[PDB]
C-alpha cells in the first residue's frame, strides 16, 4: 500500500524529509527507536510542554519492518489530533525542538531533506 512512504512533509512545513535508502536497524535503535513485535520501529517525543505530560505537540515516527518506508506526524499533546506547528510561525519553540531532534536523524543516516 501507500501509507508508508519514502518522503514525508509535516503539516505546514516547507521541508520534506526522505528516509535514507541505507537506513540501519542498529542505527534506528541507537537513536531511540523501539522495535515492536511486528518488526516496525517507532519513536515519539513531546514538544514544548507546559508541565510534565502536558505537551503542546508530539512528534511521532514509524519505520516499516522492511526498512523501506516511513510515517511521520505532528499531533497535539493528546497524541492523536493532527497539528500544524509551522503555519504563520506560531510555534517557534516547538519547531526548534523538532528540528533539533530531526537533525540527529540527518547526522546519523536516517533522514535527509532537500
Ligand atoms: Cl494504499
Residue numbers in the entry: 0 to 113
Can you provide the manuscript's text about this entry?
The structure of LP2179, a member of the PF08866 (DUF1831) family, suggests a novel α+β fold comprising two β-sheets packed against a single helix. The LP2179 gene of Lactobacillus plantarum, a lactic acid-producing bacterium found in human saliva and intestinal flora, encodes a protein with a molecular weight of 12.6 kDa (residues 1–113) and a calculated isoelectric point of 8.9. A remote structural similarity to two other uncharacterized protein families specific to the Bacillus genus (PF08868 and PF08968), as well as to prokaryotic S-adenosylmethionine decarboxylases, is consistent with a role in amino-acid metabolism. Genomic neighborhood analysis of LP2179 supports this functional assignment, which might also then be extended to PF08868 and PF08968.
The final model includes 114 residues (i.e. the residual Gly0 from the expression tag followed by residues 1–113 of LP2179), one glycerol molecule, one chloride ion and 195 water molecules in the asymmetric unit. The side chains of Lys8, Lys59 and Lys86 were not modeled owing to poor electron density. The Ramachandran plot produced by MolProbity shows that 98.2% and 100% of the residues are in favored and in favored and additionally allowed regions, respectively. LP2179 forms a single domain composed of two antiparallel β-­sheets packed against a long C-terminal helix H3. A second helix, H1, links strand β2 from the first β-sheet (order 127), which is assembled from the two N-terminal and the C-terminal β-strands, to the second β-sheet (order 3456) and packs parallel to H3. Analysis of the crystallographic packing of LP2179 using the PISA server and analytical size-exclusion chromatography in combination with static light scattering indicate that a monomer is the likely quaternary form. The H2 helix, which is absent in both YugN-like and DUF1885 homologs, might constitute an additional difference, but owing to its short size (one helical turn) and its involvement in crystal contacts (Asp88–Arg107′ and Phe85–Arg107′) it might not represent a biologically relevant conformation of this region in solution. Among these TBP-like variants, LP2179 is unique in that the N- and C-terminal β-strands are combined to form an additional β-sheet that is situated between the central β-sheet and helix H3. In LP2179, a strand is added at both the N- and C-termini, while YugN-like homologs contain an extra β-strand at the N-terminus (topology β2-α-β4-α) and PF08968 homologs contain an additional β-strand at the C-terminus that follows a circular permutation of the core fold (topology α-β4-α-β2). Although the catalytic residues (Ser and Glu) of the AdoMetDC proenzyme are not conserved in LP2179 and YugN-like or Pfam08968 homologs, sequence alignment reveals the conservation of charged and aromatic residue clusters between LP2179 and YugN-like homologs.
